[PDB]
Design a protein around this ligand. Structure first.
Ligand SMILES: [Mn+2]
Ligand SMILES: [Mn+2]
Lengths: 302, 295, 929, 165, 295
DNA sequence: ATCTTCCCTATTTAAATTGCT
DNA sequence: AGCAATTTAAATAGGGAAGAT
């Protein structure tokens, strides 16, 4: 007993998405993909900072980025490849006095549901935060091992039953429970309207710097890989007072709301893995949450 | 005054207010002292309850319980009872537990039947939501409430353990709480210590649901010491499990409406007792435990 | 339990209590109830009989003793229930009460004459500095002294004369000097910086003539001429007749004032000052509203002009007169007759029947309870208090947790919260986890109790929760600092609440040896003040030194002389009750206390010595104490272990010493399985509390429940390195201890932490005393001053413990009990006794215990500071983030057995160590790195 | 005047106010605010709130506006039409910053650029701290911030739900 | 709201006769038919009883039940040999401790476990005799009483059926009742419809032990409707086992002593209070069902 | 002085009535 | 039916004065 957790214990990320490159298409002209360019407009304004009152007279020529659709294409296309990898129970930096006990404590994990919610967050449009808002038509095409799947009307908040997501979830759960990998090429086509302004992900700027950096690969608007990884693991409906699916965190913590849902109420990942290697009976939902964290990965040492 | 409720189907639950209950001409009668004296039918009655301003005598009590009519003491409306006997087969020539109790207790033993009946009690919470539609309340068949209902049904059906069932309980109850807060334009969280009108009206309605669930469990001879969902150390968990059938369907819209107009507690009592009388909520709980126990 | 409740209440309140007392007992008719109830039934009846309102007149009898008496019902002195009650019972030569009335009335009509200067008027209106150059009490004293020098101050018309700046206002007339000291010290006492005056002044006026304006009143002094130009708008009807009637009252009674002794004058003027601040704060708290303008005294919360000075003086006078009347004519509310006390003690509590050898009708009692630990000392103290009748006492104890332990003993034996009041004035956040319903512990702060009649004379109806628990408690289980302020304070009215508390209640001070020397001086001052009003002092200390026991008896004897000559009764002596676990002895002692006390001490020593030796201590020869600790740990594990598992306590002196011993033992390569704990006091709220509860549950050896809190399967050395926080108030039982020597009472107390719960005698040696303290390598001139009575005035000639202690010795209380003044420079015990008789002496000095003449001054509260510590700033941990220069560090992780983490709380760092980083750590708290 | 509620729900992934602003934009672009439907917000303390409240005198039904906000249905909630004798009506307040009025001084007074800087150099630069929304304007192709504050009730409203004059 | 007084340390004890029980000005009281109003200490009452001509009201019953006072009605016996039917209002509004009912159910449903509990409870009356020894009447440790309880223990040890338990029950009751008859030199036959003082003192003690047994069972939430001893003659519920554990130890020697000394019924009421209070027979019964439930 | 009788003296209990739930 | 508010009034307690031994 009293199997104390290793200080070096970490797990690798098992859902690896690429950067979500963003293109402009039409709804019936889906093959002509023109890359959405981040424009950048200059704004003239004096600097106002707390530490330098002497520098407020002149300076701060700032040039803020923006990204709209072109005025001939009404559909935004978002392309990214989500790579699910198996052996989520292998610790990369941990070892096997604790990670092997985790293997033999989370073998009864229903990966079917875990994978369903992953592919449902892929398909329903959780990966399209501010640009699925106000779109009159949502479409998702998933290409997986030469199989094409079409999704039109999936409400993203609840994980309802559709056999299309389920079909992919099968091979995704077979990867995640076993050994190997699977790759889902996900292209989202959302009809926002003619010249509607799109929403790339944001680089962190300083308190000063410029107003807003949109995410650029080679000049073209895109969204962060870790931001999509936040979308995919947004499956946590099993904490106490669970209203909406949150991103599976080791503490159940969302930064933008200023509260942590699983921290400080004995449902955090660390107490559940210590309970698993000390062998108390877990329910299915918290064990699924622990396996979702191990799929997410991260260093758990102290 | 007097009033009539039903349990199985026959009008048998009779609540007496204001009337001293005595015996005249060898028959049990009652004297609304605020008026006259009326007799009580015997063949169609088994349950008699006594509200405020009411005194029964020993000889009337003996004749009442000697003819199969069993007596309980309650708050006004007959939906919060604090004093009764235990239901047996017949109250004269035998003293054995009720079939319903025995069935319940065997259901209690098998943990698989416990899980199964837990499920059935949760299903009937959703059934109550529908059956008992409110004019002032939200529609149940709209997209958000039906999405919550099918999410709860899919969660209960696919559940294999009790902890997942209680997690689904928490998310269903909050979801209905946040949706009724959504339509009433408030930011409501369920706290029993909270001093606003919505929470304390919900707490009072929960107490009246506990009382009517206690009457429904007592009416079939089943003690409230056998919780389906709640833990084995929770005192009176079965009365909480029975009251959860009507708590999210009847107590919640009545309490939110009565906090919306913001009137006092006595006509909130009157609204709750009137809603229990008109749609026979105690009868539906009786038939609920009927279809729970016999299978 | 069969009780009988009789009620003689009037009005409809009589009927409202009848519902509750008829809910719990049967009605026998004629407003008398009688029946069988349970212990907690009596409590629920108390709680809902007192809370129902004011005017409840309820007497309860359990068998034939009175259970409780609600209100000031006279009820029973011999028989119970009177008949033709009426007034004018005794009407004596009260004399000293008329003296206190005259002094308080004359001073209270003159206490705020000095607010009439123009500076105080613009201070209240707010166009100058709110701090006066000279305080208004001194200006009123200048007014009264100038009026006395000009006209005959006792029988003349008043008229305020032209006053100037006077450095001293104290003359020779003893009564005038009393009135002047009451006027000047109605806010704060004068402080004398002068060393020759502090050296020599003893008498009443002869010390009072040294109280000048420079002792706090003369703040800055640039607007003195405006501070002494005064208007005379007080000459009205009711003020002049009140002044005339009180002055003539004093005139008629001052003939008995010269027949008093010094001790009387000091205690009577202390009572007068306490009643004067009571009346002044009572009238300053409430808002009277009406005013006659042109002159003002106080300000409201809005700063508007209120309480004009004529009616302010009149209100302070009547409130102080009423304060005096209720504090001098109170039959105070006592505790319930606890039925689980009065039966006979069985087995190891069988000595508690010594109360059947004490007289139950003695007006005074000085208990010296020399019983050893584990015998139920506090239960015996409650038994001794209940032997004289109903209980009214203040259990003043050191530490919060020891008050919690005595409260839990009082709760589970027989005492409810209608009689008990646990007071810890810090609101600590140490909560009980695991199960709130299945706790049956964690004595809390509610005090259903009964509000005393003294709350109406305090400011704004006493206070909220805390002072209601202070004043109105029958039994006040409190930390001691809520009682030592009775002897007096620097600034404010914080003296009055413990003063009026200790006036009508007994005082029970347990383990007074753990306090400091100045702390023990002010505790014996409190003992003298408690004995000044006839209450009984119970001292409960096993390791008492004759010096301490003597000076506490002399303080009680001076107090009982005050009480005897105050009621005009001839002083027969003090009923001293020597008590231990082997016997009791009650003697009427007016003189020769020393031979009787030493004979009882020798009898207790002979009753301790034929018992088997439980603590055999060997002083090690190894000079270096690090490897001495190593070798002693190895030896006492190889000799003293319970099947391979042994518990060791390394008692060291200070915190960096503790972390040095810990960091050496963690890096110490050995075949022994050392498991190290740090147990000093510098720890965060959470971490510290966690250590406490764990240690209390693993070192409990009365049963084998600890086998499940540690790994006793594998042979392991469970070592706790601790500072003197382990030797005070800890119910710990170690297999053996290694002691760094600081004082001999530390040796006796850490012997009391070894085999505290078991009765098995050691074979070879269970204590290994280190050769030197670790301060020898840092300061060879003085090394025992930290946590010891060595100092700069009392230096050991040699620091070798072979020279100053026995090499093999059975350590018990005998060396501390005996008392030796000779050879104090080369033995630790005689060094200890020397200091104890040279600081707690029968003199008045200035920081001494018989203090007379200086009680009038602020000197015993400035130069004798209770809990005199270092500056002490508090670095606070807020959610894992430290406040000041802390820098969390990482411990050695070699042998730590248990380490609890902390996130909130605070650490107490001396200002000396604030310069550098305290470097807080999870294992060991504060150090120098 | 009878009124209807549009409460933004489940907008945590996206700010609540972005959904509120998109609700305003979709209510603008598909008609709704012809001249008589107005908006109000029950929870302006420092944020604009999460409830849009439409108090049209003729009466707003659920069906027309739920067909209008078909795009926001994933995170919207619509209450049944209730009544209110008094609604707390807000209006539009706009900000000007330097060059704005400079171009006005180009086109109204006909003065040169340097003297237009000269008359306005030490002036202007007001800073509105009122609660606001962020609006896509479609006729003028740039996106801006619109400030709302409490004013006396007006009979006529704009195409956005705020008071006129 | 405090600890509400635990039931085992409740002390007061009444059976009210020829008085209407009401509430005046706060307290529960009883008013006889001459104008006399005697207050009932409801916070310390274990049970009240209601004889012929008694009549309790609603809020009086509520103040008894919410405080936790079990209330029965003495009349109802109509057979020739049996105390037939006693009607008993349980305070179920206080939600009870649960796992003691679960333990009682797990021993009740298993037939061999019910027989094992039947065994220990039959020797519980034997040890009751040994513990509760009166100063008057017989001595328990004489040769005849020890011989009959030894034959009883030997026969109940080798028993295997509940009808054998009923037969041995009958020989035990005949043996004790007749030995007490011999000591008090009277001829004794147990008829509940007899004018002899040894009989109606025994029926008064039947009512007293009934009230003690429902307060002991309700203090642990145990229903009367689970009789571990059952039969044609023995059909009263669990009260006719936890009530006659203490006949031949407490009531029957006290009833014979009261019928031998021969003052009124009130000395017998007060003697039942005195012996149920001094030896803590209620807490003794509760602690015995405690060591029954967890074994 | 002590004690009793009687007159204030008003303070102190018990009944009576009656909306209110 | 219990209670509460609130009146109404009968009575209980006490203090002062005066008359006895
Ligand atoms: Mn002052
Ligand atoms: Mn003052």
């Amino acid at each position: 007993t009293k199997l104390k957790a290793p200080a070096v214990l970490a797990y690798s990320r098992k859902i690896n998405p690429t950067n979500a490159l963003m293109f402009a298409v039409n709804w019936s002209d889906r093959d002509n993909t023109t890359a959405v360019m981040v424009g950048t407009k200059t704004v003239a304004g004096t600097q106002s900072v707390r530490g330098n009152p002497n520098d407020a007279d002149k300076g701060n020529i700032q040039t803020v980025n923006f990204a709209n659709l072109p005025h001939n294409k009404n559909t935004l296309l978002v392309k990214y490849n989500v790579k699910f990898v198996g052996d989520v129970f292998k610790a990369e930096l941990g070892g096997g006095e604790y990670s092997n006990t985790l293997q033999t404590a989370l073998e009864n994990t229903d990966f079917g549901t875990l994978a369903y919610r992953y592919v449902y967050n892929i398909a329903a449009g959780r990966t399209l935060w501010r640009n699925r808002v106000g779109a009159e038509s949502i479409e998702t095409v998933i290409t997986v091992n030469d199989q094409t799947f079409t999704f039109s009307d999936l409400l993203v908040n609840e994980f309802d039953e559709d056999v299309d997501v389920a079909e992919i979830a099968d091979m995704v759960a077979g990867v995640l429970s076993g050994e190997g990998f699977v790759t889902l090429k996900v292209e989202h086509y959302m009809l926002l309207g003619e010249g509607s302004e799109v929403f790339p992900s944001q680089e962190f700027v300083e308190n000063s710097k410029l107003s807003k950096q949109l995410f650029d690969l080679n000049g073209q608007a895109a969204m962060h890989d870790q931001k999509i990884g936040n979308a995919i693991r947004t499956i946590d409906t099993w904490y106490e007072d669970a209203t909406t699916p949150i991103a599976v965190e080791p503490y159940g913590s969302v930064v933008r709301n200023g509260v942590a849902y699983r921290a400080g109420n004995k449902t955090d990942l660390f107490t559940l893995m210590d309970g698993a290697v000390n062998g108390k009976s877990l329910t299915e939902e918290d064990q699924m949450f622990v396996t979702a964290n191990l799929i997410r990965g991260g260093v758990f040492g102290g | 005054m007097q009033k009539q409720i039903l349990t199985s189907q026959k009008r048998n639950m009779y609540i007496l207010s204001r009337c001293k209950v005595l015996v005249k001409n060898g028959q049990v009668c009652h004297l609304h002292e605020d008026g006259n004296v009326y007799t009580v039918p015997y063949a169609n009655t088994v349950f008699i309850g006594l509200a405020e301003g009411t005194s029964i005598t020993n000889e009337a009590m003996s004749m009442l319980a000697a003819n199969g009519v069993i007596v309980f003491w309650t708050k006004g409306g007959g939906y919060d009872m604090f004093a009764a006997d235990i239901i047996c087969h017949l109250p004269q020539a035998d003293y054995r537990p009720t079939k319903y109790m025995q069935n319940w207790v065997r259901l209690w033993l098998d943990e698989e039947k416990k899980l199964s009946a837990a499920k059935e009690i949760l299903k009937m919470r959703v059934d109550s939501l529908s059956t008992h539609v409110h004019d002032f309340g939200v529609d149940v068949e709209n997209k958000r409430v039906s999405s919550i209902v099918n999410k709860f049904d899919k969660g209960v059906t696919q559940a294999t353990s009790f902890e997942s069932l209680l997690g689904h309980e928490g998310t269903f109850v909050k979801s209905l709480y946040k949706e009724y807060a959504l339509e009433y334009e408030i930011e409501f969280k369920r706290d029993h210590k909270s001093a606003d009108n919505y929470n304390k009206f919900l707490t009072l309605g929960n107490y009246y649901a506990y009382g009517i669930a206690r009457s429904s469990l007592w009416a079939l001879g089943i003690d409230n010491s056998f919780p389906l969902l709640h833990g084995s150390t929770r005192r009176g968990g079965l009365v909480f499990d029975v009251a959860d059938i009507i708590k999210t369907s009847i107590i919640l819209p009545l309490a939110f409406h009565a906090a919306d107009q913001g009137m006092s507690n006595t006509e909130f009592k009157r609204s709750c007792v009137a809603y229990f009388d008109k749609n026979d909520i105690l009868a539906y709980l009786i038939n609920n435990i009927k279809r729970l126990c016999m299978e | 339990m069969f009780i009988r409740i009789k009620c003689f209440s009037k009005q409809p309140i009589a009927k409202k209590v009848s519902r509750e007392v008829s809910a719990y007992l049967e009605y026998t008719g004629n407003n008398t109830w009688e029946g069988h109830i349970s212990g907690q039934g009596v409590s629920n009846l108390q709680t809902k009989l007192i809370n129902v309102g004011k005017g409840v007149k309820v007497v309860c009898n359990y068998q034939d003793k009175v259970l409780f008496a609600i209100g000031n019902v006279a009820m029973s002195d011999t028989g119970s229930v009177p008949k033709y009650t009426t007034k004018k019972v005794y009407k004596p030569d009260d004399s000293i009460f008329t003296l206190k009335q005259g002094l308080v009335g004359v001073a209270a009509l003159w206490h705020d004459l000095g607010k009439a200067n123009s500076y105080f008027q613009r201070k209240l209106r707010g166009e100058c500095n709110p701090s006066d150059p000279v305080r208004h009490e001194w200006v009123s004293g200048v007014i009264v002294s100038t009026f006395a020098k000009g006209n005959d101050w006792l029988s003349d018309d008043f008229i305020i004369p032209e006053v100037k700046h006077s450095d001293n206002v104290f003359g020779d007339d003893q009564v005038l000097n009393a009135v002047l000291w009451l006027i000047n010290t109605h806010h704060k006492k004068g402080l004398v910086e002068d060393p020759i005056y502090r050296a020599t002044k003893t008498m009443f006026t002869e010390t009072l003539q040294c109280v000048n304006v420079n002792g706090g009143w003369f703040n800055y002094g640039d607007n003195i001429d405006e501070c002494y130009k005064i208007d005379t708008s007080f000459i009205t009807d009711t003020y002049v007749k009140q002044l005339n009637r009180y002055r003539k009252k004093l005139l008629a009674t001052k003939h008995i004032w010269f027949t008093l002794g010094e001790d009387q004058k000091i205690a009577i003027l202390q009572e007068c000052r306490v009643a004067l601040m009571l009346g002044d704060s009572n009238f300053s708290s409430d808002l009277i509203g009406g005013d006659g303008s042109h002159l003002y005294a106080n300000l409201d919360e809005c700063g508007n002009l209120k309480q004009t000075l004529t009616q302010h003086l009149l209100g302070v006078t009547d409130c102080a007169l009423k304060a005096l009347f209720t504090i001098n004519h109170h039959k105070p509310v006592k505790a319930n007759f606890i039925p689980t006390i009065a039966e006979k003690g069985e087995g190891k509590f069988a000595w508690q029947n010594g109360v059947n050898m004490v007289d139950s009708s003695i007006d005074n009692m000085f208990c010296i309870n020399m019983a050893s630990t584990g015998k139920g000392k506090t239960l015996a103290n409650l038994k001794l208090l209940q032997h004289f009748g109903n209980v009214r006492c203040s259990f003043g104890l050191g530490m919060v947790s020891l008050t919690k332990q005595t409260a839990k003993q009082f709760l589970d034996m027989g005492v409810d919260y209608n009689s008990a009041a646990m007071v810890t004035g810090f609101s600590k956040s140490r909560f009980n986890l695991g199960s709130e319903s299945l706790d049956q512990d964690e004595v809390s702060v509610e005090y259903w109790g009964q509000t005393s009649s003294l709350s109406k004379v305090f400011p704004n109806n006493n206070a909220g929760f805390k002072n209601k628990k202070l004043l109105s408690a029958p039994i006040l289980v409190t930390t001691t600092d809520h009682l030592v302020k009775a002897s007096g304070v620097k600034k404010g009215n914080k003296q009055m609440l413990p003063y009026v508390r200790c006036m009508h209640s007994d005082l029970v001070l347990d383990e007074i040896d753990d306090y400091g020397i100045e702390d023990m001086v002010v505790l014996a001052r409190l003992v003298y003040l408690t004995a000044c009003y006839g209450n009984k002092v119970i001292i409960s200390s096993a390791t008492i030194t004759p010096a301490i026991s003597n000076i506490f008896y002399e303080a009680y004897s001076s107090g009982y002389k005050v009480f005897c000559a105050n009621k005009q009764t001839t002083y027969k002596g003090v009923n001293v009750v020597w008590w231990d676990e082997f016997g009791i002895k009650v003697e009427k002692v007016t003189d020769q206390f020393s031979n009787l006390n030493t004979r009882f001490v020798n009898k207790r020593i002979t009753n301790l010595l034929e018992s088997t030796p439980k603590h055999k201590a060997l002083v090690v020869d190894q000079d270096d104490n690090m490897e001495a600790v190593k070798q002693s740990i190895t030896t006492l594990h190889n000799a003293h272990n319970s099947g391979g598992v042994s518990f060791g306590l390394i008692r060291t002196t200070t915190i960096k010493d503790c972390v040095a011993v810990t960091q050496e033992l963690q890096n110490w390569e050995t075949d022994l399985s050392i498991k190290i704990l740090c147990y000093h006091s510098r720890f965060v709220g959470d971490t510290k509390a966690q250590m406490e509860e764990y240690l209390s549950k693993v070192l409990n050896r009365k049963g084998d429940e600890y086998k499940k809190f540690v790994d006793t399967t594998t042979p392991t050395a469970y070592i706790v390195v601790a500072t003197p926080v382990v030797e005070v108030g800890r119910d710990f039982d170690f297999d053996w201890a290694i002691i760094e020597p600081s004082s001999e009472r530390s040796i006796v107390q850490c012997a009391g932490r070894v085999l505290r719960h078991r009765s098995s005698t050691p074979t070879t040696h269970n204590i290994h005393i280190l050769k030197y303290p670790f301060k020898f390598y840092r300061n060879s001139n003085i090394c025992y001053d930290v946590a010891g009575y060595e100092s700069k005035g009392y230096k050991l000639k040699s620091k070798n413990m072979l020279d100053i202690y026995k090499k093999e010795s059975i350590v018990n209380s005998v060396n501390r009990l005996q008392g030796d003044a000779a050879f104090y420079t080369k033995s630790l015990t005689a060094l200890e006794h020397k200091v104890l008789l040279d600081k707690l002496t029968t003199d008045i000095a200035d920081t001494n215990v018989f203090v007379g003449g200086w009680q009038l001054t602020a000197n015993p509260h400035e130069y004798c500071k209770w809990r005199r510590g270092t500056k002490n700033e508090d670095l606070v941990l807020t959610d894992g983030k430290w406040s000041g220069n802390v820098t969390t560090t990482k411990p050695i992780q070699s042998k730590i057995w248990r380490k609890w983490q902390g996130e909130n709380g605070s650490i107490t760092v001396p200002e000396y160590l604030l310069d550098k980083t305290i470097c807080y750590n999870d294992f060991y708290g504060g150090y120098e790195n | 005047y009878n009124t209807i509620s549009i409460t933004v729900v489940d907008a945590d992934d996206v700010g609540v106010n972005f959904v509120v602003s998109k609700v305003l934009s979709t209510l603008h672009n598909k008609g709704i605010f012809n001249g008589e439907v107005g908006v109000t917000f029950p929870r302006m303390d420092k944020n604009v709130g999460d409830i849009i409240t439409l108090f049209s005198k003729t009466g707003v039904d659920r069906k027309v506006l739920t067909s209008t906000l078909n795009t926001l249905t994933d995170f919207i909630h619509i209450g049944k039409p209730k009544e209110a004798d008094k609604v707390k009506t807000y209006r539009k307040v706009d900000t000007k910053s330097k060059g704005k009025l400079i171009r006005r001084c180009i086109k109204r007074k006909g003065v040169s650029a340097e003297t237009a800087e000269s008359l306005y150099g030490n002036y202007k630069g007001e800073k509105c701290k009122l609660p606001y929304i962020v609006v896509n304007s479609k006729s003028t192709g740039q996106r801006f911030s619109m400030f709302l504050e409490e004013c006396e009730n007006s009979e006529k409203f704009n195409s956005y739900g705020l008071c006129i004059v």
